[PDB]
Structures are given as C-alpha cells and as structure tokens.
C-alpha cells in the first residue's frame, strides 16, 4: 500500500542484501509480511514500484542477490526482482 511498510519490512534484508549468506527470520518474514499484505494488482503495482525505488536508493547492489530472496525465503513470487522491472506487466 505505502512504501514506508516495504521499507520497513525490507529493512532486515539490508544484511543479506549486501553480504550474501542466508537471510535471517526477519529478512524472510518482511519478504512473507510484505506479499502477503499486496493482493490486488494495484497493490502489487504500488510495491514493486515502491522496491524500485528502494533500489535507486541502494543503487549500488546486486539485483541477482535479490532474486534469489524468495528461493530462500519460500516465495514464488510474480515479477523477477530486478532494478529495472517494468512493473507495468503486472
Ligand atoms: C537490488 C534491486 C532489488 C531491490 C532489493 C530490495 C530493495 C533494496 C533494499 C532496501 C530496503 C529498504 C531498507 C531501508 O531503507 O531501511
């Protein structure tokens, strides 16, 4: 809905986000919190662009760090996780 709560459900992810390894139970649980909370496509518009535009405020991270996210955190989700996803073909 609002990205203040991507970010802040994003926010334990930093750490996997820049140093790899296996996401914590916070990273996991702000991925599952957030897919949860975005259900009508105009929800999942607003957040994807919402994590776009977290990525242009993290612009010097891997995108394939960030893909393999939801692999690890059980997530299948519906868009690859990518700084430059169009988020339109939702
Ligand atoms: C690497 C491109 C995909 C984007 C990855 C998720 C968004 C970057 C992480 C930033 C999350 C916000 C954390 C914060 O601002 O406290």
């Not at 612009?59 to 891997?62: E, G, R, S």
């Given at each position: 809905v609002t990205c203040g709560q991507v970010d802040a459900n994003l926010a334990p992810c930093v750490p996997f986000l820049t140093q790899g390894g296996e996401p914590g139970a916070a990273c996991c649980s702000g991925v599952k919190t957030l897919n949860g909370n975005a259900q009508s496509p105009d929800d999942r518009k607003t957040a994807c662009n919402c994590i776009k535009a977290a990525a242009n405020r993290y612009?010097?991270?891997?995108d394939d760090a960030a893909q393999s996210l939801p692999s690890k955190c059980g997530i299948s989700l519906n868009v690859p996780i990518s700084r430059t996803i169009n988020c339109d073909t939702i």
């Open positions: 612009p010097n991270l891997k």
